[PDB]
Design a binder for these strands. Structure first.
Ligand SMILES: [Mg+2]
Lengths: 1212, 134
DNA sequence: AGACAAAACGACGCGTCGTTTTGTCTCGGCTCCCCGACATTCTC
């Protein structure tokens, strides 16, 4: 008779909640609560998740983590190189004296930046390899290029020299460190492809296009021939860009079965595709027939202006670096006796692996070659195991008691699909699911071909041999043909047919020199496990060779046949091995079945079923189905459901229905919710906040008691993922335990559709009140644009309706530009009963009389629907104009982080590797500390610097956007002179001057713009800016990096007062917030430097009240009588900078018109947010605003007596 | 080179003639204009008024004279309560001493002088307690 | 009366809140787990 209704509307980042107490039968009822919860994120995310572009902050954190991890692994490699080389006595005294080797193993001493090559004596720097430098300059003068070159070019000369000559040890250490710097591309799997693997980058010329006689789309397709004599595989339409074109391709050659090259083609562009540049550098290095270091040295010899790093060689296969470093080390080995002294080798071994005697024993057999390449430099870790993330069976469990005395359950991991045993399960399931039909009359022709167990067994022996089965094989097995019979499945679809066993049978047939009886079931399982488990190449052939040794099969073609196996497809079945093991014996029939393979419990249940006695674990439906199971012989060939029930006693997944009793269950459910359990973070956040809001309304309006919500209505308005999950979750509150309400969802949950909501809004006048609420924004726009095009008069309503000009009507929506529409939708959903949704979803009646009862009950006479009560519209107006919007906040600055790291610990007289938790305190910053771009400080005499600001200069490309003002913002004066000379030479047009062709022309003829004076080419210049940039850090060279605050990191805005009364404003950066929160203090200082006491601090999504000019709000409080005037003066912070704070009225979501620099108009000026109110007084918001605090439901929170009592009652 | 502070102990041993040596130590601890916390002055007033039963007028004269000419009062810091609570998790002193240390630290003091505070000890790697009478 | 108090004063620099305008790290390979949606078949 009286019903509590909760209407929920779910958006991308909005939850509209409304609770009403309806009595529809008497046309009575009243609203209780209304609100809209908003999760703030930029509209960039809104426009991105529809298409999808890395829309997750977790992914960005993962990317930074991976970059850092690579960095510290490179550092670790370097450290170990320092340790080993210091042991070998290879580092020079000047360098080695300032690496720590005792406490910080291999690290540099703090506040020192050593270079291996520049010895510093009395403040002067000197090069140490004078003689090799002399030899390199001798080489250049023999080549006749110059006699004056950089000293640090000696490394490539040494790398060439190291191949076939004796170099001193320090050069060799430098070379090893260089190799550690540049490691090269490498795929962990390997898996060498087709032996030819042509993949050859070639540049070809087209001779002629003979017209091929292939007429498509009314245009006749041409063919392509090349001068060196192949044909392009694909045809061509456009003739202009193919005739005598110097086109470059990557082609792949495969020797087909006929004995010819099946050549492919693919158009690629050099200097634009990574693969093309990689292959070109590969071929160009190989054709030189020399190591990459010597190749680089030769290219530097022939073109001394060549850019090596990033231009000449960017990325090459790791094989080149490996082979070059090898050749270097073997060649240097014969001359340096330290590379033969096994004492030193053992010393390095022990130093590097003190606590791992096993690894020491392994490496005591190797030498310095393997230790340097295979151990330190080129060591690539394997992928972490994902086995721990494998799913679990829903049936097999294990129970055990921990140290706490409790009893908890370990899961059993699901079966890999390629396992032969799941193969048996699956294809037996197919055997039972198999049935045949005739093509002529479509009758159930089976029970004539498969009626006895022998037919099943023979079909089994034929399928067991094959690898895939299809229409043809299935028909011809029975001697049937295509023309008369079919098999109830897709006529042209194939089904799996024990892939693993067939494939292994074929490969084992190819090896020969063995009898045709070696392959049995256990052998099949063991070899499958060998293939599935060891997925690493060298390990793979070692396991294969050992298997061929133990099993008396010749390892001659065994390993050759058994090397080329496609790795198993990564997929796992629904169930585990033990469960399927228990299942299969029951559905076995014939000779493969025997009673002894049924376990104890299923045998007992079989005896119980045949006996017909009464068991609590056997239901009546079982006997209903198992009436035919009279004898123990009847337990042959049972289907999946029968065998599953007999094994475990459940008729599939019957669910648990469940029913929550109080807010305790709910809050526990939220406490136990796991991250990343849904499609994407957006819907997960939406669902979690919906749950939280439901709990809050339950507590506030019903005190968490049973069945306080009589019914709940849900609506969404991609997003469909929420329509069913939230309904299933919320069924647990409104479900009835009487047995009437059963299913996936409670019958009380009534999802609707947009048709009902829009029709109710139009009929009941919610649209009219919505326009009346939103219109003043439109009059403000009209006044600001001094026009009348934003309001349109009408005479059917005799009033002004909001509107927009067509050229500002791109995607304007009058609902979308606010926040409370969510709550309005929630309200209009809640009052909609099941009868309304049934009527408006099944309006097709087939007879007017049958649905005429609903017509008369719900609609006025079929014109308009009856209101839920007489004062529905007025009450809805009163609520809608009295809703404050609650905005979720993320002020996470620091949080605690746990660090577990592997380490060898001494326990019970033995060292064991175990994880240790980090000692001391260590915080994790939860915001990006600054922006990526890094600038350096400069001091220019020819510019005036205001106090409190500095000049920072950054390198930028010289391009077409460089006009006189920007050219004057280039820090180099001579570059400015030359550049303005050039720009004058091109009639003052940077676009013509600074095109790549123009830049090239400037570079070639630099004399005729530098007054005839010589100068190096220019491509990038350091432009300087004047502003406030802070140091990134205080260690090493970090004190020279100047960065800018990151986006959305100005989170606190302090408002202070002096004893006289004036307000002072400040914005504290994230650095001081971090430091203060680390020292346990408040985020914002409570007094400024002037001693002014702090009113309070503001953060984005805060709420403030802006009092009228006449009101004197000093000890107002009494925030219970919030009326329309009071609530309309509520502003939400949006951003801050310096002493400026920008605000938007809390009911505004989107502006009527944004700001464009052309028209120079907008709803809230250029920033789309104001430092003042929108109303006519236009008062500084920050000078009179008072901060307020709301809860999830938008209810104000203020100090009261009871609160004051409880502050220290909780301590009492 | 280092902002040195003091506590009520230095003033109290300075005041008394019963131990000449400690009195001396204390007075040459005051010659260098050592900084001082307002809570130190409050406790000094409490002990003069309670233990010694001295008149209000003369102890107030002495306080004013010392603050004008002898010791440099340090402005009471507004974050003293939160910082003292922060030091409270890692340290176990009398809470009055913890407020003294908190206000000394928040004012950038490098060296503190006292007796009943476990000399030589480091407080949040910012300030160390030193017993000067030894 | 003479010598203090303070207003001019000619200087530049500064700074002016109000507002708009400008700037903002990038691409490459590959493996392996989980879930979702829509297709077909069988059973409860
Ligand atoms: Mg004390």
């Amino acid at each position: 008779m009286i019903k509590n209704i909760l209407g929920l509307a779910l958006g991308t980042n909005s939850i509209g909640w409304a609770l009403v107490k309806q009595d529809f039968e008497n046309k009575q009822g009243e609203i209780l609560g209304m609100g809209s919860r908003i999760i703030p994120m930029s509209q960039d995310i809104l426009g991105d998740f529809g298409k999808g572009n890395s829309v997750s902050q977790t992914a960005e954190r993962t990317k930074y983590r991976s970059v850092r991890r690579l960095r510290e692994r490179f550092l670790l490699r370097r450290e170990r190189l320092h340790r080993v080389l210091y042991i070998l006595n290879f580092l020079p005294e000047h360098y080695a004296s300032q690496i720590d080797f005792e406490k910080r193993l291999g690290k540099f001493k703090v506040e020192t930046e050593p270079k291996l090559v520049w010895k510093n004596t009395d403040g002067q720097f000197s090069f140490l390899f004078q003689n090799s430098f002399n030899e390199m300059l001798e080489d250049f003068k023999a080549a006749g290029q110059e006699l004056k070159i950089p000293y640090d070019w000696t490394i490539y000369h040494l790398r060439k020299k190291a191949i076939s000559q004796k170099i001193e040890k320090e050069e060799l250490a430098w070379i090893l460190l260089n190799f550690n710097h540049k490691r090269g591309y490498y795929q962990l799997r390997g898996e060498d492809f087709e032996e030819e693997k042509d993949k050859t980058f070639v540049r070809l010329k087209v001779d002629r296009i003979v017209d091929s006689g292939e007429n498509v789309k009314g245009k006749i397709l041409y063919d392509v021939y090349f001068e060196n004599g192949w044909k392009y595989d694909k045809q061509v339409v456009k003739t202009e860009d193919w005739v005598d074109r110097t086109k470059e391709f990557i082609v792949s050659e495969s020797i087909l079965k006929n004995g010819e090259t099946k050549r492919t083609f693919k158009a690629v562009d050099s200097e634009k595709d990574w693969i093309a540049i990689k292959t070109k550098t590969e071929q160009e290095i190989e054709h030189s027939h020399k190591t990459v270091g010597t190749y680089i040295y030769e290219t530097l010899l022939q073109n001394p202006k060549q850019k090596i790093k990033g231009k000449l060689v960017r990325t090459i296969e790791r094989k080149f670096y490996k082979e070059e470093l090898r050749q270097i080390l073997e060649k240097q080995k014969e001359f340096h006796q330290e590379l033969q002294s096994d004492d030193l080798y053992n010393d390095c071994i022990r130093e590097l692996y003190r606590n791992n005697e096993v690894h020491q024993l392994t490496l005591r057999k190797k030498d310095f070659v393997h230790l340097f390449m295979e151990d330190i430099i080129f060591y690539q870790r394997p992928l972490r195991s994902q086995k721990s993330s494998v799913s679990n069976c829903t049936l097999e469990f294990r129970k055990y008691k921990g140290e706490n005395g409790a009893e908890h359950t370990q899961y059993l991991k699901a079966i890999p699909k390629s396992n032969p045993y799941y193969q048996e399960f699956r294809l037996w399931q197919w055997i039972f699911n198999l049935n045949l039909y005739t093509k002529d009359n479509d009758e159930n022709v089976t029970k004539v071909f498969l009626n006895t167990t022998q037919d099943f067994e023979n079909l089994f022996e034929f399928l067991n041999t094959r690898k895939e089965v299809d229409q043809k094989a299935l028909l011809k097995h029975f001697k049937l043909n295509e023309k008369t019979h079919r098999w109830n499945f897709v006529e042209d679809k194939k089904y799996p047919c024990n892939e693993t066993k067939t494939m292994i049978s074929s490969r084992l047939d190819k090896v020969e020199n063995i009898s045709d009886d070696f392959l049995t079931r256990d052998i099949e399982q063991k070899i499958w496990h060998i293939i599935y488990s060891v997925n690493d190449k060298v390990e793979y052939e070692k396991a294969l060779k050992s298997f061929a040794r133990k099993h008396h099969l010749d390892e001659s073609s065994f390993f050759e046949a058994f090397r080329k196996f496609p790795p198993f497809k990564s997929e796992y079945g629904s169930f585990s091995e033990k469960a399927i093991k228990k299942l299969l014996p029951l559905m076995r029939l014939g000779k493969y079945w025997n009673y002894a393979e049924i376990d104890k419990y299923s045998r007992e249940r079989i005896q119980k079923i045949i006996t017909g006695e009464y068991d609590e674990n056997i239901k009546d439906k079982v006997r209903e189905k198992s009436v035919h199971l009279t004898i123990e012989n009847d337990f042959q060939g049972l289907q999946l459901w029968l065998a599953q029930y007999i094994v475990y006693g459940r008729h599939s997944e019957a669910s648990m229905i469940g029913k929550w009793n109080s807010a305790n269950d709910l809050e526990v459910f939220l406490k136990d919710f796991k991250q990343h359990s849904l499609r994407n973070p957006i819907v997960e956040q939406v669902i979690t906040e919906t749950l939280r809001v439901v709990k809050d309304i339950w507590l506030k309006y019903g005190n968490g008691t049973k069945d306080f919500f009589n019914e709940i209505h849900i609506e969404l308005g991609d997003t469909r993922y929420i329509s069913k999950y939230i309904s299933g979750i919320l069924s647990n509150i409104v479900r009835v335990e009487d047995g009437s309400d059963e299913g996936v969802n409670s019958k009380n949950i009534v999802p609707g559709n947009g048709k009902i909501t829009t029709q109710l809004k139009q009929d009941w006048g919610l649209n009219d009140v919505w326009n009346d609420l939103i219109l003043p924004r439109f009059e403000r726009m009209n006044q600001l644009t001094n026009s009348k095009d934003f309001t349109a008069w009408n005479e059917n309503h005799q009033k002004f309706l909001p509107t927009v000009p067509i050229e500002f009507s791109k995607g304007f929506s009058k609902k979308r530009i606010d926040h409370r529409h969510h709550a309005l939708d929630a309200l209009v959903i809640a009052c909609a009963t099941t009868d309304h949704v049934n009527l408006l979803n099944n309006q097709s009646a087939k007879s007017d009389t049958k649905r005429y009862d609903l017509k008369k009950k719900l609609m006025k006479f079929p014109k308009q629907f009856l209101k839920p009560w007489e004062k529905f519209t007025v009450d809805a107006k009163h609520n809608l104009e009295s809703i404050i919007v609650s905005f979720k906040q993320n002020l996470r600055v620091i949080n605690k982080a746990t660090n577990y790291y592997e380490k060898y610990v001494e326990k019970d007289g033995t060292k064991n590797k175990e994880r240790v938790e980090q000692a001391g305190t260590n915080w994790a910053i939860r915001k990006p500390m600054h922006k990526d771009t890094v600038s350096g400080k400069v001091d220019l005499p020819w510019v005036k610097v205001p106090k409190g600001k500095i000049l920072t200069a950054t390198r930028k490309s010289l391009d077409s956007s460089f006009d006189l003002k920007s050219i004057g913002s280039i820090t180099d004066t001579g570059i400015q002179k030359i550049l303005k000379n050039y720009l004058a030479f091109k009639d003052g047009n940077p676009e013509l001057a600074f095109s790549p062709e123009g830049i090239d022309d400037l570079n070639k003829n630099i004399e005729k713009y530098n007054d005839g004076k010589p100068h190096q080419p220019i491509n990038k210049v350091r432009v300087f800016e004047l502003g406030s940039k802070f140091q990134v850090g205080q260690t090493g060279n970090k004190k020279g990096k100047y960065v800018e605050a990151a986006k959305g990191t100005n989170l606190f805005f302090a408002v202070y007062e002096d004893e006289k009364g004036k307000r002072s404003y400040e914005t504290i950066p994230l650095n001081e917030v971090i430091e203060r929160q680390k020292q346990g203090l408040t985020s914002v200082p409570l007094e400024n430097e002037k001693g002014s006491r702090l009113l309070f601090d503001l953060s984005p999504n805060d709420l403030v009240y802006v009092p009228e000019i006449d009101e004197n709000i000093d000890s107002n409080f009494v925030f219970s009588n919030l009326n329309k005037e009071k609530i309309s003066r509520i502003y939400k912070v949006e951003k801050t900078s310096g002493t400026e704070c920008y605000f938007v009225r809390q009911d505004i979501a989107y502006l009527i018109k944004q700001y464009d620099a052309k028209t120079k108009i907008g709803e809230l000026e250029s920033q789309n947010k104001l430092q003042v109110t929108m109303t006519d007084d236009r008062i500084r918001i920050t000078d009179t605003c008072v901060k307020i605090n709301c809860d999830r439901l938008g209810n104000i929170n203020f100090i009261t007596k009871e609160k004051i009592k409880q502050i220290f009652n909780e301590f009492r | 080179l280092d902002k040195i502070a003091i506590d009520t102990n230095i003033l109290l041993y300075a005041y008394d003639n019963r131990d000449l040596d400690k009195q001396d130590r204390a007075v040459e601890i005051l010659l260098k204009k050592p900084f001082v916390t307002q809570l130190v002055v409050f406790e000094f007033i409490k002990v003069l008024e309670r233990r010694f039963k001295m008149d209000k007028k003369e102890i107030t004269k002495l306080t004013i004279k010392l603050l004008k000419e002898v010791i440099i009062p340090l402005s009471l810091h507004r974050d003293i309560y939160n910082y003292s609570q922060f030091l409270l998790q890692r340290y176990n002193f009398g809470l009055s001493d913890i407020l003294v240390l908190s206000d000394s630290i928040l004012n950038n003091c490098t060296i503190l002088l006292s007796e009943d505070m476990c000399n030589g000890m480091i407080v949040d790697k910012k300030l160390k307690i030193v017993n000067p009478f030894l």
